């Protein structure tokens with residue numbers, strides 16, 4: 025028997041679905057999502073890291089003029105400074121006083137730290153969905169890890185569960201993703217080869233192992249101070265270091281729908297978005313004929329207390345006459361009321377207790393137990409607590425979902441005005457009919 | 464390698480209508496942040512350097 029149901033894409037909240045196969049005792053399955061993971065396909069564009077500026081010992085040509093060659097190094101500059109008269113600890117470097125030239129050169133390359141400290145610029149595409157689902161099947165708790173792309177059936181005590189596809193394609197990740205360590209950012213990083221000095225992407229490399237480095241650091245060689253051999257320069261400080269200080273909050277803290285973010289692999293977890301269809305294939309061997317199952321008659325529902333709190337603050341007591349001892353499925357016939365128990369044990373002439381949660385001011389609902397329905401009704405009171413640490417176990421209310429007395433007052437007022445209009449309309453019609461009758 | 468970091472003291476929490484009131488007791492500057500769990504997270508954050 026194939027059963028298709030849909031549950032809200034929430035985590036930590038159980039949902040109950042009724043499997044109704046006429047001629048057989050009904051089954052109620054309680055399904056709870058424990059984890060939902062969206063894992064985006066990533067394509068690395070480039071990585072960034074702190075650069076080091078390499079400055080080879082300066083060449084001082086005494087009593088002559090030095091010249092430099094162009095090089096292909098990532099960000100290379102060379103300059104020859106004339107009129108240099110450098111000193112060493114033991115005295116002037118060389119014989120000539122003014123006829124001296126110094127050749128300064130430098131290039132930018134990835135530091136050794138880039139193997140550990142780097143950010144990866146990824147292109148994000150579609151995401152593969154997977155989920156961990158808790159299923160209460162015939163009184164037993166089975167946890168199944170399965171893909172949620174609608175293409176994976178996982179067996180629960182010989183029943184097959186197919187999860188997904190998810191109804192929402194929404195992801196917390198934008199097309200451009202930058203990953204540092206455990207932190208993922210939605211940053212619109214520059215194209216490779218289009219970096220800017222002092223900004224993220226000032227130094228870029230396609231892969232961690234690549235020798236191919238793009239750099240734009242504005243490295244400018246300056247003239248050395250008199251009497252010295254040092255090589256001064258003006259360069260924009262690593263944009264990686266600046267970025268690390270200016271990162272701001274990561275998606276783990278800023279994402280919509282309460283999404284949790286993790287890396288290695290990049291994952292969006294437990295996003296409260298849309299809903300998730302589940303298809304369940306239950307073998308005939310799992311069904312018990314109604315003639316073998318317990319059957320209840322002479323049922324009556326009374327609700328001694330009701331609070332419309334997020335938790336199961338409502339309690340209902342239902343009288344029953346059971347034909348035989350055994351377990352019996354319990355189902356709510358209305359979306360407005362959630363029942364905590366999936367099944368109860370019943371025998372003889374007695375009463376059963378069930379707990380429920382509703383947002384209704386007036387709880388009017390039916391309960392089906394072993395294919396026998398009862399009608400429950402109660403006046404529910406508000407909670408005194410303002411805040412809780414858990415999500416509601418009940419659905420939200422529609423505009424039509426109002427208290428019994430509120431409906432009565434609306435009918436009295438609406439009827440009162442409608443009556444006045446109906447009377448005025450009647451008088452006008454009668455007068456017009458008289459006016460038409462007269463010539 | 465893995466570094467050890469402190470955990471700020473539990474806040475004193477009281478409740479009002481659609482409101483959570485926290486009294487914070489930092490030893491050192493501590494980042495506080497919060498988000499809505501719906502469509503518009505309205506993320507906000509501040510550093511707390513004293514009881515607030």
Ligand SMILES: *[C@@H]1O[C@H](CO[C@@H]2O[C@@H](C)[C@@H](O)[C@@H](O)[C@@H]2O)[C@@H](O[C@@H]2O[C@H](CO)[C@@H](O[C@@H]3O[C@H](CO)[C@@H](O)[C@H](O)[C@@H]3O)[C@H](O)[C@H]2NC(C)=O)[C@H](O)[C@H]1NC(C)=O
Pocket residue numbers: 038160163164165
């Ligand atoms: C099927 O599983 C549900 C949910 O519990 C899940 O399975 C458990 C074995 C654990 O691994 C859980 O971490 C996991 O979520 C069971 O319902 C849960 O039962 C436990 C008791 O076993 C309830 O905890 C109690 O809660 C009260 C009130 O706070 C405390 O006073 C108690 O000290 C104790 O902590 C838990 O609240 C309840 N959860 C729900 C949603 O009802 C269920 O009983 C189990 N069924 C079977 C046949 O195993």
